[PDB]
Design a protein around this motif. Structure first.
Motif, short mmCIF file in Angstrom:
data_model
loop_
_atom_site.label_atom_id
_atom_site.label_comp_id
_atom_site.label_asym_id
_atom_site.label_seq_id
_atom_site.Cartn_x
_atom_site.Cartn_y
_atom_site.Cartn_z
N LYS A 60 0.84 -1.19 0.00
CA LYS A 60 0.00 0.00 0.00
C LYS A 60 0.88 1.25 0.00
CE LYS A 60 -3.59 2.65 2.33
NZ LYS A 60 -4.32 2.93 3.59
N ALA A 61 1.94 1.22 0.79
CA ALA A 61 2.85 2.37 0.89
C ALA A 61 3.45 2.69 -0.48
CB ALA A 61 3.95 2.08 1.90
N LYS A 62 3.74 1.64 -1.24
CA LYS A 62 4.33 1.77 -2.57
C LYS A 62 3.33 2.19 -3.65
CE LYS A 62 7.83 0.90 -5.48
NZ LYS A 62 8.38 -0.48 -5.32
N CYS A 63 2.05 1.91 -3.45
CA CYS A 63 1.03 2.25 -4.44
C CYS A 63 0.42 3.64 -4.26
CB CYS A 63 -0.09 1.20 -4.41
SG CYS A 63 -1.45 1.46 -5.56
N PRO A 64 0.44 4.47 -5.32
CA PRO A 64 -0.14 5.81 -5.22
C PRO A 64 -1.60 5.71 -4.78
CG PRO A 64 1.28 5.70 -7.11
CD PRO A 64 1.09 4.27 -6.62
N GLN A 65 -2.01 6.59 -3.86
CA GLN A 65 -3.37 6.59 -3.34
C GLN A 65 -4.15 7.81 -3.82
OE1 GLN A 65 -4.42 3.91 -1.14
NE2 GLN A 65 -2.50 3.10 -2.00
K K Z 1 1.27 5.21 -1.22
#
Ligand code: K
Length: 108
Positions: A60-65
């Motif tokens: 999740k930290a790596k995926c743009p939100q």
């Molecule tokens: K993120």
């Protein structure tokens, strides 16, 4: 309690619903499943709940939100989506589990 494997393709919501729209792809597949009287086994899930599981913290930290994902019990379809979309990541998880009680749930 029996669990099954779910495969997913993950990307930012902006990419999936704006840059590279997947509406037509899903519409087409849904249409084919209909004429084949086949049970739907793929789902578009905005801000997926599986991403909140503790074990998905790094992903999740790596995926743009905000994020969005296409989930399916059909692994080949998901791998094809990766080839088709490119700017995404893919993976799998077992559910339902304690950390992923609702595999297809969307958190808005
Ligand atoms: K993120």
């Amino acid at each position: 309690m029996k669990m099954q494997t779910y495969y997913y393709v993950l990307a930012s919501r902006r990419f999936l619903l704006q840059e590279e729209p997947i509406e037509e792809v899903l519409k087409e597949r849904t249409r084919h499943y209909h004429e084949q009287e086949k049970e739907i086994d793929f789902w578009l899930v905005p801000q997926p709940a599986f991403l909140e599981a503790p074990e998905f913290a790094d992903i999740k930290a790596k995926c743009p939100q905000p994020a969005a994902a296409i989930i399916s019990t059909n692994s080949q379809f998901i791998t094809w989506l990766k080839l088709r979309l490119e700017y995404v990541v893919t993976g799998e998880f077992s559910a339902p589990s304690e950390t992923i009680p609702n595999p297809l749930a969307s958190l808005a």
